[model samples]
Target: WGNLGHETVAYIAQSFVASSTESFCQNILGDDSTSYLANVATWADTYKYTDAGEFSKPYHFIDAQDNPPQSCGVDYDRDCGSAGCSISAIQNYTNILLESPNGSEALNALKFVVHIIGDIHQPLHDENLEAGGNGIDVTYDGETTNLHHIWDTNMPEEAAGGYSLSVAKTYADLLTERIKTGTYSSKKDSWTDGIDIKDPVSTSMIWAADANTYVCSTVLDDGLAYINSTDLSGEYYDKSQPVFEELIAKAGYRLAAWLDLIASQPS
Candidate 1:
């Protein structure tokens, strides 16, 4: 997910979070406004590209070692490596928060929590082929771009109308409803299944696997030939809107649950 997607996910979770969880994040962020969670949603992205934040780069994605457009799966041992992928990183950061660190330590953990949760929801972030679609060149809305960029940035901005804070909030409002009693009403409860702060591997893998499934079902349903032929922002975008919408809600719901885990940490 890009800034739009990441911030939207944070805001969506903001709407669903427990009151204590809200305050926890707000205090760590050093603000009291409603969009506190979203304010630092893209921090990981910027930090990862820097010289010192280099080690945090692999924390953004898992790179499942499975075949896609054919079949897809996530094996923590096979996918996560010494550098630590999203699954392991989520657990790593969550545990840090569980220990109840203060100041910059807690802030760093919270930032990673907000970002990585949204990153894993992106199907490409869970796969390996084409460098998670970065190498797969395709045209979107007339501009030539890589498939990863199409999913991470362009399509999200298209779905939400724009990248402004208001747009992300408006979109988050709609998706949060989908979690409450709209499109994903019945499926919402299952979004947090197996989520437990004490067990990060089992907990985060659920999201990794959920996103991984889409790699075959839609991301590359018919492989590069089909993807290259279609204008993704046109027809492909329409078809994927519902999927990403659900993903945003799911990410939000799970994020709230993850925070609830923080809420449970010993004070």
Candidate 2:
């Protein structure tokens, strides 16, 4: 996910954070603003470019070595490479937070947590072929771009309104409402069913797989040629709007719940 996607997820999570947990996050983040979390949701992307955070690049995604549009799955043993992945990264950062890392350290870990949680929800992050859609060419709103880039930007940004904090906030507020007492409320529990603060590895894997399932059924429903020939910003975007919107909704809620659970632990 790009900055817009990451911030949308961050804002949504912030919307549902329990009061005490929200205070905990603010204190750790060193920011008291309502939009504090969204402000730093893309810090990991910044962190990844520096020499010290080079190894953190793979933490943004865990490519499942599977053939999409036919079969898709996320097996931790098969997908998580040696450099590291979201699952392992989640475990590492969560451990640091649980043990009560220092102010700066805790802020870094929380940023990674917020960022990576949004990243794994993107199907491309969990996919394999065409370099996770980077190699595939597709037209979106008349512009030719890689499938992954469109998914990370145009498609979702357009769906959520546009590329602005106000857009992310407005969309996130709607998503948060859906989770609270609207369409998504019924399945909210199911989203967090796999969450176990004691087992970040398994919990993260579960969320990864949830997004991976769309790779075959939706993300690449036909084949590359079929996808390439189609204009994504039109009906394709309309069809996928709901899909990614649901995912965004799921990611946001899961993030809030996951953080709340962590805050509940004896940190």
lDDT of each: 0.87, 0.87
* Candidate 2: residue 227 Cα off by (Å): 1.1
Total colliding residue pairs, candidate 1: 0
What is the per-residue lDDT of model 1 for residues 109-145, given as tens digits with 9 covering 90 to 100?
9999999999999999999998899999998988899
RMSD of 2: 1.3
Q: Report the C-alpha displacement of residue 31, candidate 1, in angstroms.
A: 1.9
**In candidate 2, which residue pairs clash?**
none
lDDT (C-alpha) at residue 29 in model 1: 78
Backbone clash count for every predicted candidate, in the order shown: 0, 0
